[PDB]
């Protein structure tokens, strides 16, 4: 019984990275594996195997910083179901175009506190192969009780956000990333950091 292909094969970006995900083949047994491949650079193009997801039992595969991967151009992934003595047809994803489709992660806020100056600085753990994206961030600040929040101006990754305080309980900081290539993309806000004062 030939093995039936994966379903809803989807190549997507999340947190600066790219993932291929899929669902099990209709008629299949559990206890099957999957093999994944991707296209190399358009001018030296073939399907290459992802070593990490060779015979994986998972339903996803990280598709970032792969060998011979060109993120400045479109690329597809493919998945096939594999069991010994059998293999399904490949199922390809749609092209993903990283510069235009990457989804930014929230920053990690580095916090310092001078007597009356609260400083928030955005840091990122970026895939080592990532193109040099232009990243900015936006801090939200609020008194844990009093509802109204203050949104500070968009700040380039690399500059801190300075916040002047008022003697006045818990106070809170959050930040989101804005990435603009052709069309602005916003991350969710980071997990708030709340502290006593």
């Amino acid at each position: 019984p030939r093995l039936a292909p994966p379903q809803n094969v989807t190549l997507l970006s999340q947190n600066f990275s790219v993932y291929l995900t899929w669902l099990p083949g209709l008629g299949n047994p559990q206890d099957v594996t999957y093999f994944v491949a991707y296209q190399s650079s358009p001018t030296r193009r073939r399907w290459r195997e992802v070593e990490e997801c060779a015979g994986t039992k998972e339903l996803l595969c990280s598709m970032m910083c792969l060998k011979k991967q060109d993120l400045y151009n479109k690329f597809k992934g493919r998945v096939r179901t594999v069991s010994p003595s059998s293999k399904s047809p490949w199922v390809e994803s749609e092209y993903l175009d990283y510069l235009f489709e990457v989804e930014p992660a929230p920053p990690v806020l580095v916090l310092t506190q001078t007597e009356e100056i609260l400083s928030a600085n955005a840091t990122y753990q970026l895939p080592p192969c990532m193109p040099p994206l232009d990243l900015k961030y936006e801090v939200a600040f609020w008194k844990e009780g009093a509802g109204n929040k203050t949104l500070f101006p968009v700040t380039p990754h690399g500059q801190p956000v300075q916040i002047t305080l008022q003697p006045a309980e818990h106070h809170c900081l959050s930040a989101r990333t804005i990435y603009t290539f052709s069309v602005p993309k916003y991350s969710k806000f980071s997990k708030p950091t709340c502290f006593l004062l």
Binding site: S41, P42, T43, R44, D70, Y72, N73, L99, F100, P131, P132, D134, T180, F181, S182, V183
Partner: protein
Amino acid sequence: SLSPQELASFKKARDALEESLKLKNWSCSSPVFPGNWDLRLLQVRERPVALEAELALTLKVLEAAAGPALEDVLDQPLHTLHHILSQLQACIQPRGRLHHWLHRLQEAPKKESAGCLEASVTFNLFRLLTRDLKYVADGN
């Protein structure tokens, strides 16, 4: 750093070129750009020269793209490319990597088909605009 409108313009051109290349046979006997093409492999002083060479090659090739449809979509991209080139040249200033890389790009138009050259510079376009331009602007 390129604007959204400019990048939208390049994308529209790049995609139009890609589509036209699906109708052509554009195989290369040898790829146009080196497999490890990256200005970081070069001395800082050599980088602008490398960047100039790929810019000139890109212009040469795209300015020859055939048919009204492509000329139309390439019109504004060619204009932005001309401006980037000219700005680069107003900032500019024994055989090794730079020399060999320069040779490869100069010789390519003589040895390869039009489709092949068209394919090469189109697929090189966003790396050029995004990576190569930035590294040069940083190192100065």
